[PDB]
Symmetry: D2
Subunit: 115 residues, 4 copies
Amino acid sequence: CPLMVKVLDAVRGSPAINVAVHVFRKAADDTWEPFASGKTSESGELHGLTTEEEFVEGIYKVEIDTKSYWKALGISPFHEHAEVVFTANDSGPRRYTIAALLSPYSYSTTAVVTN
Amino acid sequence: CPLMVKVLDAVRGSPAINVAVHVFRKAADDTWEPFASGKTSESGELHGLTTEEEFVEGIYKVEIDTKSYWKALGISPFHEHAEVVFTANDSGPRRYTIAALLSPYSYSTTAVVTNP
Amino acid sequence: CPLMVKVLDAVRGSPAINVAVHVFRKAADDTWEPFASGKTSESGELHGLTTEEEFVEGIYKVEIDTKSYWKALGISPFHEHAEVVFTANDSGPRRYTIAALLSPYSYSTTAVVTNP
Amino acid sequence: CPLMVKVLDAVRGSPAINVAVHVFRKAADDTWEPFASGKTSESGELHGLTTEEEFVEGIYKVEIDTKSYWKALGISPFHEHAEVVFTANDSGPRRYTIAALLSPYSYSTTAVVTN
């Protein structure tokens, strides 16, 4: 599991469950090509987005549908979505946990890069 | 004026100075069209990006070039930038302060939205 | 002046208004002795807590009563307060902005430290 | 495991390893009585602080020795330590994950309260 997304809800103090997450890889013409997606689990986690072989070096965007999340909770969100854009190495894998802490008008994202 | 970007460096406890900030507005159309850009001042603030009249309803993207910031300080950061995307002025003109707090492997962004 | 506390509400995207803030300084002695206190204004800022001369070297504790803030908005928050503890003026007088960004189950605090 | 502490390093994008954490419970005379402590593991986590029976309702302080952490990494920290003070319920357990994201001049703490 080279890429994992964990999303937390700072309002409810809970995993952010059922948050849509899209992953894009930057194509040669600089467009975002869809790569992977899923919804965060009961634990606010999204595993199995990619595999080591598929998760090559490149620029990746993780788009977290924070707006729909806040919408479902009846809370006015500010952001359309939380985007995390990063280069996957050099030098090598490396597992990536993209942690997002969500509030209606604020989010943080943190990369926990291990091995 | 109606849009300000304030950037802090969570490593130094300082304004993040000379941080490039690009603002885009989503067109008809769905493409991001260049709206405004600037750099943060010595206070980490970027003022004067737009005017109440120019800053109409829309979906705006504020792209903060955090990577160049960190790289100019010798740090290979995780993120390419900090991008903040939001609908502005949906229920009337507001002032938006887009705050980013930067760490090499983390940023937060906070919107402070006021009336006018 | 040398110490300012700025509090934001990450749920509303607003200054956190009327937030009680208590500042303590560690005495000789190891006890926290009451240094200053105040409430945040409509800008979420608390100015005038101290003066350069009063704000000497020390370990300071800024206790932000986030609980009362959230509870006055109907929310049972997680934290009792946001407490920021730091050594001030170790290498000379500085200006300290203590920023807190509040969510019912999370806060961040950021120090912006400048010269003078 | 009713109380868990997870600490992340926003500078290195890594678990904050070997971070001293003290847990205090507020005594009747409002003093902080030491309750539990440990050091975050390789995964930036600290488990086994307490048990359901011992982790009664009360006001608890989790003190995270962020300063020594930054000291060991040769980075000037601002804070003496990250303190998290909270009431353990009502109404009941409930597992508490106290997540702290650390930077030299900023930290966030988030409570992930489940069940």
